[PDB]
């Protein structure tokens, strides 16, 4: 954490880190420093005690597994997209929300084992016996507080008990909303609220749902990058999916097409179905509530057209 303290972002990156399409990929060693800068810009330069902030960040990095997808890179990618959402919609969210939301995005896949909630729930893994719904997401938030409770790690120690419980509730709700099983119902209710004109950001329940969709938009953001970036991320998503599907066939169950490596040919079509049914509706309703988030929708539409090109045999 000591080396992280002297870090300062190069001026060329300051301008590009504000953009939606921004790719963190070529700057591996700058990632912890990129998170510090984003926290200082959105929240404040002395928001947290720098020593504790840097202790927490590095401890979070250490608690991300050597998995192909749900690793340290994924968490920084999710945190960056959130920053760009918060920067373009600043006055709609409180200081406590902006700090909680950036922290939640960095902690959202903490201790992920490269396994879905569906696997754990059927093979009766202790986590499934501990949490029935949103299995991994409840474990991620469990690991978040367990990093905060370490010596010289509680970054929220300056806050009042009322603010500390509010921020932890903001983080719990945020990490839970990353369970894609919850997205479908959440987005439908918001689409109803928008069309009727009943949506009100001063209604705490409505606010939680909008924050929920922001969480999904960020967790899925790898579909809003440039085509060569998105393509290389799809390799990481599937390498993990297949490794899970490999364990499934060892136990005696047949894996789903997305989790079976002997089915790599269905990948462009599987991606197209995911874009039409999940990705595109997500960013469409996000652009409706938050119009400055429109570039996320455009980049996703660009990537759907690219999957449409691979399907037509013109790769
Ligand atoms: C679970 O069902 C699916 C299926 C497919 C085919 C997907 N294809 C994708 N492409 N890009 C993204 C992003 C993405 C996601 C979202 N996932 C969340 C869980 O972790 C892996 C990624 C998918 C999720
Ligand atoms: Mg997750
Ligand atoms: Zn995630």
- Provide the CATH number for the domain around residue 246: 1.10.1300.10
Tokens of 54: 């840097």
Tokens of 33: 């420093």
Nearest by Cα to 186 from 304, 256, 289, 87: 289
Q: Classify residue 180 as exposed, middle or buried by CB count within 10 Å of its CB (0-12, 13-18, 19+).
A: middle
Compute CA distances 292 → 85, 87, 89, 309, whole Å.
8, 10, 7, 28
Compute CA distances 164 → 104, 158, 161, whole Å.
14, 9, 5
Alpha-carbon dihedral of residues 1, 141, 81, 282, nearest 10 degrees?
Answer: 170
Residue 89 DSSP label: T
Residues 6+ apart with CB under 8 A from 145: 168
The atom number, within ligand 1, closest to the CA of 230 reads: 11
The resolution, in angstroms to one decimal, equals 2.3
Nearest by Cα to 119 from 233, 237, 215, 246: 246
Q: Are 113 and 57 in contact (CB under 8 A)?
A: no
Compute CA distances 31 → 4, 34, 130, 281, 296, whole Å.
10, 5, 33, 30, 21
Q: Which stretches of 47-160 are DSSP H helices?
A: 50-62, 72-88, 95-107, 117-122, 126-130, 135-148
Which residues sit in the known binding site for a divalent metal cation? 74, 108-109, 219
Cα–Cα dist 192/90, whole Å: 25
Q: How close is the Cα of 15 to the center of ligand 3, in Å? A: 26
Residue 253 DSSP label: P
- For residue 168, count other CB atoms closer than 10 A to its CB: 17
In the residue annotation, 90 being an active-site residue is answered as no
Q: Which ligand is nearest to the CA of 225?
A: 1
Q: How close is the Cα of 247 to the center of ligand 1, in Å? A: 19
SS3 state of residue 122:
helix
Cα–Cα dist 194/209, whole Å: 12
Ligand 1 atom 7 nearest Cα: 274
Residues 6+ apart with CB under 8 A from 140: 107, 108, 109, 110, 111, 112, 175, 178
Ligand 1 atom 5 nearest Cα: 274
Helix (H) or strand (E) holding 273: helix 267-274
Residue 255 DSSP label: P
Query: What is the number of domains present in the chain?
Result: 1
Long-range contacts of 242-247 (CB under 8 A, 24+ apart): 243/68, 243/114, 244/114, 244/115, 244/116, 244/119, 247/119
Q: Which ligand is nearest to the CA of 244?
A: 1
Long-range contacts of 236-239 (CB under 8 A, 24+ apart): 236/68, 236/69, 237/69, 238/264, 238/267, 239/68, 239/69
Nearest by Cα to 279 from 309, 234, 311, 232: 234
Q: Are 46 and 250 in contact (CB under 8 A)?
A: no
Longest dimension (CA), the chain: 59
Cα–Cα dist 34/13, whole Å: 9
* Residue range(s) defining the domain that contains residue 252: 1-315
Say how many CA atoms lie within 13 Å of 188 toward its Cβ. 6
Q: How close is the Cα of 313 to the center of ligand 3, in Å? A: 31
Cα–Cα dist 79/264, whole Å: 30
Report the structure determination method: X-ray
Transcribe 154-194 into DSSP letters.
-TTTTS-HHHHHHHHHHHHHHHHTT-HHHHHHHHHHHHHHH
Q: Are 113 and 155 in contact (CB under 8 A)?
A: no
- Encode burial over 227-238: b for 16+ CB neighbours within 10 A, e otherwise: eebbeebbebbb
SS3 state of residue 52:
helix
Pocket of ligand 1 (CB under 6 A): 180, 220, 222-223, 234, 237, 258, 270-271, 274
Instruction: Describe the crossing of helices 161-176 and 95-107 by its angle, rounded to 10 degrees.
Output: 50
Ligand 1 atom 13 nearest Cα: 220
Residues 6+ apart with CB under 8 A from 130: 138, 139
Question: What does the chain come to in residues?
Answer: 315
């Amino acid at each position: 954490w000591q080396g992280l303290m002297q870090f300062t972002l190069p001026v060329r990156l300051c301008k590009e880190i504000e953009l939606f399409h921004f790719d963190i990929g070529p700057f591996e060693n700058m990632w912890p420093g990129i998170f510090v800068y984003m926290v200082h810009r959105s929240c404040g330069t002395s928001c947290f005690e720098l020593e504790k902030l840097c202790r927490f960040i590095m401890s979070v990095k250490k608690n991300y597994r050597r998995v192909p997808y749900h690793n340290w890179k994924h968490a920084v990618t999710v945190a960056h997209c959130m920053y760009a959402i918060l920067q373009n919609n600043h006055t709609l969210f409180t200081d406590l929300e902006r700090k909680g939301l950036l922290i939640a995005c960095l902690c959202h896949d903490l201790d992920h084992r490269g396994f879905s909630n569906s696997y754990l729930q059927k093979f009766d893994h202790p986590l499934a016996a501990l949490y029935s719904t949103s299995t991994m997401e409840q474990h991620h938030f469990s690991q978040t507080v367990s990093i905060l409770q370490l010596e010289g790690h509680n970054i929220f120690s300056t806050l009042s008990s009322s603010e500390y419980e509010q921020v932890l509730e903001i983080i719990r709700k945020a990490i839970i909303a990353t369970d894609l099983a919850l997205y479908f119902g959440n987005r439908k209710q918001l689409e109803e609220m928008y069309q009727t004109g009943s949506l009100n950001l001063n209604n705490q329940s409505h606010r939680d749902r909008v924050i929920g969709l922001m969480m999904t938009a960020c967790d899925l953001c790898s579909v809003t990058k440039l085509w060569p970036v998105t393509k290389l991320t799809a390799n990481d998503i599937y390498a993990e999916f297949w490794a899970e599907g490999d364990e499934m066939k060892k136990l005696g169950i047949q894996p789903i097409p997305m989790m079976d490596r002997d089915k790599k040919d269905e990948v462009p079509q599987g991606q197209l179905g995911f874009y039409n049914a999940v990705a595109i509706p997500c960013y469409t309703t996000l652009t409706q509530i938050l119009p400055p988030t429109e570039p996320l929708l455009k980049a996703c539409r660009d990537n759907l057209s690219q999957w449409e090109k691979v399907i037509r045999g013109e790769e």
